[PDB]
Amino acid sequence: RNEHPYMLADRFTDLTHPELIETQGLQIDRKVAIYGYLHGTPLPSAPGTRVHIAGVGDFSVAQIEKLPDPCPTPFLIYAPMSDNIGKLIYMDNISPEECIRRWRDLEKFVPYFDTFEKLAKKWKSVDAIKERFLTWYELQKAKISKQLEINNIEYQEMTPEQRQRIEGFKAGSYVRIVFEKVPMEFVKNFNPKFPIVMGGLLPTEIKFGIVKARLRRHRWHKKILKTNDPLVLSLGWRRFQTLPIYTTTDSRTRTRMLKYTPEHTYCNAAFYGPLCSPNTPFCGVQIVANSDTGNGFRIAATGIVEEIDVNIEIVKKLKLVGFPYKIFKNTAFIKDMFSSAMEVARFEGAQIKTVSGIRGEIKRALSKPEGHYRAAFEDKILMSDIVILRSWYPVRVKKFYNPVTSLLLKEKTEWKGLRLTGQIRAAMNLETPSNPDSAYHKIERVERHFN
Amino acid sequence: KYTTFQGSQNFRLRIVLATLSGKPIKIEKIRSGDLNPGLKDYEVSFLRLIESVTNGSVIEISYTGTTVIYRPGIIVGGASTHICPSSKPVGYFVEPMLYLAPFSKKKFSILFKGITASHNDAGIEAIKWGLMPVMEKFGVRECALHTLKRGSPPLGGGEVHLVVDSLIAQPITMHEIDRPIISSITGVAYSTRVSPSLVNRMIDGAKKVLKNLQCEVNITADVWRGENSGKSPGWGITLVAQSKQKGWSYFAEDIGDAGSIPEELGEKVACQLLEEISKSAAVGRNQLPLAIVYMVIGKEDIGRLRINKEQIDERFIILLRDIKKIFNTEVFLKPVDEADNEDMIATIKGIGFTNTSKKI
Amino acid sequence: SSFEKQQIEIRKQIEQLENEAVAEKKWSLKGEVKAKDRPEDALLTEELEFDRTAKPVPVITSEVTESLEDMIRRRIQDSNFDDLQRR
Amino acid sequence: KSSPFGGSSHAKGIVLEKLGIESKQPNSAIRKCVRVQLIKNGKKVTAFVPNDGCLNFVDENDEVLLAGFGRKGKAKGDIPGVRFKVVKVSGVSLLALWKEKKEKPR
Amino acid sequence: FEARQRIEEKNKESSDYHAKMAHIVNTINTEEGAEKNKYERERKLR
Amino acid sequence: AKLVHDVQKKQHRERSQLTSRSRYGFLEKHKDYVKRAQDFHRKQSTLKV
Amino acid sequence: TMQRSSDVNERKLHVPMVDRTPEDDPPPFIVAVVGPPGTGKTTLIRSLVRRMTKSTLNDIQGPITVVSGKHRRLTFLE
Amino acid sequence: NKRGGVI
Amino acid sequence: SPDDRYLAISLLDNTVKVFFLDSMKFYLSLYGHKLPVLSIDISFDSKMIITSSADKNIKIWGLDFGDC
């Protein structure tokens, strides 16, 4: 709130034209005055600022007019919705040569000069420029207060720029705004119970891209969070349902994909979304409606934004498992991890390992048993030992982005979006994609003798 | 539908201001009334330079070559190299990166192939001792620029390597009001792959016009030997006035082409240095655009800076008009109170812009 | 309305990726893929990477044989080689 | 003179940046270190945060509280030089954050 | 060819990484162990 | 447990031998392998002597 | 002593930030009434505005800007 | 890692 | 010079001064023989002198910068 120009709205006016709304018949983009009181940083007075109002999406201003405040103070209730040179530069029509000629080419970096001979006649003597040629906390507090007083002092200047077009609706002033492109359902369901806030976007938070953050299962949330499992982020100003993907730098060499989040620690995460500054925190909710509330805690994941870009690359493990059928001493013939001579010809020279944890290397294709081929190892493979080829298939984020847009609904709660994986499975009455050999068992080590 | 330009002018600065503000840009009518119209080879290479520096920036060129679209992206930098075309030296390709540079995810180590210096463009000792100090006082701390090997027109063979790795959040706001006292006048004279008499007869022929001036003169010689000399013979002279009490610099240049007396070029550069310190106050006439771009791109403050009256040229007008039609920031002008010289003071409410690319 | 068609295209991508999520996996995201659990030879068309035991045989190029050639030129010009001596 | 910093047992410090993000070995003494700006002197020193899993709470300029360390032995990966551990971040004890009782406000 | 190139860049980045982080841990070791020993030196007489 | 939780040092159950390849059952793991390999080293050493 | 003082003076140490406004026109500070439903909110709003303008209301809705003292106002939001 | 381009 | 551009003068100091005829403004002092230059010729378009001495070697010198 110290670096964003924000504003609660307390008064609302749908100044369209009634003959126009009767003309098109309930289809228009209702231009709307919002009479409110702004806070935060000064609002940039040039019309065209991106401002996000909550629960409809972000718009841009069209005209802004500050008014005398209806609830002033000594130098009282108010209840709406209830009972020369500078202009010589900046005027646009004239040419810069006309500007300089009535005041009295930039690819070429060197500044334009004149004839060197008369320059030398000018500077045969040099006496003109010969006059020119002769605690830490309260430290920073003094620096910022000195900045604030020179700020106010050089704001104390000529009126029409430092009061309405160079410093911009300074701090805490009652204003009227006019938007366009506001959908009809906002005005059609304008309940004054629910608030309508707004905040001026920075340039760095209008662009969409992929954010890398560090999440956490919230410590009173009862359920772990799945990858590619939709949740609604309260990042910054917006609130949007997106599809996160959770990664961990496995000892800071990579960014590999997980399946869920850890139970008690911070883990990295990535998702599509609008951009924001780094080092900014957010909350993130599961189901927001009221039909599905239960006795459960609603806040799912908190955490801050690490950094942002437009394309990250995350991988995941996949182990091409094979089977020996013909072992030898120190080498073996392995089967059906690959299927073709061209596949093993791609993978000539790759390292592998066994489930007994011994290293190995896939040496050459076998010719006729087209899947099978020949590999050498540290010592003897048993016939009952599955080999493993560690590889990294790259996955990528989904570009899904619904802002919640709560105050356009018919009912203003019971908001729905993408449901969770468990409940869409329960809705179409499927069963969880289990696997019979994947399940653990009470293992039974027997005392293995030797010959 | 966002921001649109006419005329094949000011092109590097329009692209770097688009990349700074984050706004996209159309530019139409790139020399449409020409016998050989369209976008030049060196500026096409400049756009490929920009696309290698940033990430996610999309650019379309007209098939007639007379317009260019640019949606920017984030700047990521990276350790790369760039061959530069022989139509244009490396100062032209390093000067817009010199103030797009301190804001990426990573450092800047982008070393340039090709011709070192030229007449119209920025020399390398020019860039160093006249654009490093203004940035070091604006708020960057480790910006360096080395020469692996020099070059010369028109054969080139020059290799130049800049690094910046003080990735600051935003430049601080400058408050320079006075007329800065000059503490020393230094300079260097280089010769790539000719005889070593040229440098000394440059230095003495330069310093004879300012031996009468009281201030201490120091010009340093450098020949360039062996393979490091490059592929064309040439020589040049750099003058820099240093204000060490607060750390400013003025600078003037030239190179000497074929059929040119080094004594006369040395005193020509010294008289153009006197020209610039006449026309200048606290910033150079070529140090000006980088400085005001930094003061508009720093923090949400008032940045004030004093210039004398003759700085205001058609370049200043077109730069102010361009910076308005990117992000609508008027500059206020404070005339100084002792006005036998009507010195303006550019005060700009800076945007509170910062880089949002850092790993944090 | 514009908001109405917005919600129906949102509803469209909602539907397509909920059935993507509940539906069958790719072969290439499930770990432990054998030969019989794949498209037969999808792997050349994969752009898939891994790690290897040892650096393979350096294929001898014209530039490396001329580099060792100018090395032996310098060495046999200077006669600084290393043989055995008598006793 | 009565302490490693002036005479106080604790001093509020502004975190510059996380030292040793890119250490590969987890729970390594390069990894569990952080640059911190002493305010009552105003200078930058480097300090520990125990349990690099709970390093990730404190990030950047979050006015942490800086106590002594007191090496009671000779651990192997323990580098010398540092004698400052972090005891709170932004007011709340990061030990309590690590055992997830309290919450970090911002 | 892909094998030789990937092994080369992996060896290059590992040899960079080891030296760089060992450099930074040794300089922050000595530039604070010096004043720690001077602190125990000035504290030992009281 | 110095500065770690029980859920930090919990457990990691081992996967069993598959059911497809179950004719030659009991997949052997790293401790089984070293239990076999040191015995084979012993037998090769006494054969060498 | 110095012992009870040299540890308690670090309460004066913080991160140096700025607070956006001089004494020109400070805004109505937004005051939010949050609770579980069916307790507190509207009656506390009614009592506060009754004490603060010597006048109650009925069926209040939307943010209401009410003065409090000669300095500054505030804004209530159920 | 790159996304944009020149066309 | 054959197109009367400038004149080259040797010295018994082991050097040649290239020297204007319009202006005499000491264009170049190109050297490097170590025994006195005792023949001088100029190219037919004043681009390239050929200088020579009693060191038995001849030096072909481009005149755009006094290079070799």
Ligand SMILES: Nc1nc2c(ncn2[C@@H]2O[C@H](COP(=O)(O)OP(=O)(O)OP(=O)(O)O)[C@@H](O)[C@H]2O)c(=O)[nH]1
């Ligand atoms: N016993 C008791 N009941 C109270 C008290 N204060 C308010 N109530 C009851 O709460 C009822 C509802 O009024 P509010 O509490 O203002 O309703 P609200 O807080 O605005 O919550 P919503 O009705 O959901 O908007 C009143 O009819 C009172 O009977 C109290 O202090 N004690």
Ligand SMILES: [Mg+2]
């Ligand atoms: Mg109520």
